[PDB]
Amino acid sequence: EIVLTQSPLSLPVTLGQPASISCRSSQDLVYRDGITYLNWFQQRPGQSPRRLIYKVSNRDSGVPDRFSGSGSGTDFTLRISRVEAEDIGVYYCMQGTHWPITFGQGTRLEIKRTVAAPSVFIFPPSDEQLKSGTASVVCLLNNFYPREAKVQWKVDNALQSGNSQESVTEQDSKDSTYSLSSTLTLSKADYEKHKVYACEVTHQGLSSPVTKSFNR
Amino acid sequence: QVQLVQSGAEVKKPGASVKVSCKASGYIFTSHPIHWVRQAPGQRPEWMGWINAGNGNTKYSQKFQDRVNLTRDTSASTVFMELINLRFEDTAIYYCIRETKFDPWGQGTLVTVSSASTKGPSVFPLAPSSKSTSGGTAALGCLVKDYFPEPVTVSWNSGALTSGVHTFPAVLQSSGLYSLSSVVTVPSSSLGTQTYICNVNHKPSNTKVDKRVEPK
């Protein structure tokens, strides 16, 4: 019933720069000695949430000084002095003043770092899959920034469209990079009517496109 | 030490019921009450209920009253969450949380409410070659094709190989089935000396595979 609302819902923040997330309630503060029961959680990639701030401003154990909590009644803030690469994740405000316990939507904190061009690698179909009647060609893009990249598939000089599936990993906590996978999927029949298979990669870190190909 | 371990992911048909486990360890079970919170895709985390692990006394959310049953096994230090009349909106990741300092949250249990047939994945190697090698680094991986439902946990050399590992988020195909790839950057010198195995586990289907990815 108490509806909590987090203002920036996605927040890209440069390494060393400050970050803020807002939470708007409907007056948190129990009758008992005026304690406001607003807590902040951090859900890191491949991890369950971890409480950072409790009781508006109180840091939980092992929480860095850079994390700060503020607010009164209906408007609350989570402020990060200077963002570190390990701060990538979703942040939820949660109230425990009155039951039911309610949460904010979440705020994905992205990191802005310097441009890194990806390493391209191409994988021809496995013979095991070719025995099962289908052929998948995978084009790997590794440890690049920004997330924005373009993979064109060219089968015997014909540009493919639609018959590809891209997939990007969450941002790395260690170095703030991304890795992307592009899978072009053909049938053993279509795959054997052609010879040249190439994935052309275009990115901010590249002065010219990187084409990586193979023949059967 | 102080941890909460949850049961594996379950696919259930609409109308049916799900029972989730949550084993306590590194503290006295009865000493601390448990909380249950689910997160539906692109929705706020929602609080379902609370249970006193000591005396079995419960408190539910109006939405979850007469649909949720919170029971126990104190000798097993396991708390249970039973959700009946499974609707399509109940496809969420379910979390058990210890009350005190809202820590620790359990790893979560993904429950998929669907009419579709469960399908175990087929594991194919992303084998290394000259076409997937840049400056004394080879790329290799597994292609975990056509499975239903989510999730699929992927690891390398029984979780002893972590550096260079990029397990991509799954992608839903035209067939309403999922695909995933897991990649790893290894030195070219280790191919033919070190074995690289990728351990794929799909608990809803009860499929576990160890796939040796060799150069060709």
Residue numbers in the entry:
A (entry chain L), B (entry chain H): 1 to 216
Task: Provide passages from the article that reported this PDB entry.
In this work, we have studied the binding and determined the structures of two antigen-specific Fabs derived from human monoclonal antibodies raised against NHBA, one of the components of the meningococcal B vaccine Bexsero. NHBA is a lipoprotein that is specific to Neisseria species, and its gene is ubiquitous in all meningococcal group B strains. As part of the analyses of these Bexsero-specific antibodies and in an attempt to increase the structural characterization of NHBA, we selected two mAbs (named 12E1 and 10C3) which, according to preliminary epitope-mapping studies, bind to the NHBA N-terminal region between residues 1 and 300.
Crystals of apo Fab 12E1 diffracted to 2.7 Å resolution, belonged to space group P21212 and contained a single 12E1 molecule in the asymmetric unit (Matthews coefficient of 2.66 Å3 Da−1, solvent content of 53.8%; Matthews, 1968). Excellent and continuous electron-density maps allowed modelling of the Fab 12E1 molecule including residues Gln1–Lys216 for the heavy (H) chain and Glu1–Arg216 for the light (L) chain, while the final C-terminal residues of the H chain (residues Ser217–Gln228, including the TEV cleavage site) and three residues of the L chain (Gly217–Cys219) could not be modelled owing to a lack of electron density. Specifically, the presence of these positively charged patches in the paratope of 12E1 allows us to speculate on an apparent charge complementarity with the overall acidic nature of the linear epitope previously mapped on several NHBA variants (p1, p2, p3, p5, p18, p20, p21 and p29) consisting of residues 73-AAVSEENTGN-82 (Giuliani et al., in preparation). The binding affinities were also measured for NHBA sequence variants p3 (long variant) and p20 (short variant), showing that Fabs 12E1 and 10C3 recognize all variants tested with high binding affinity, except for NHBAp20, for which no binding by Fab 10C3 was detected.
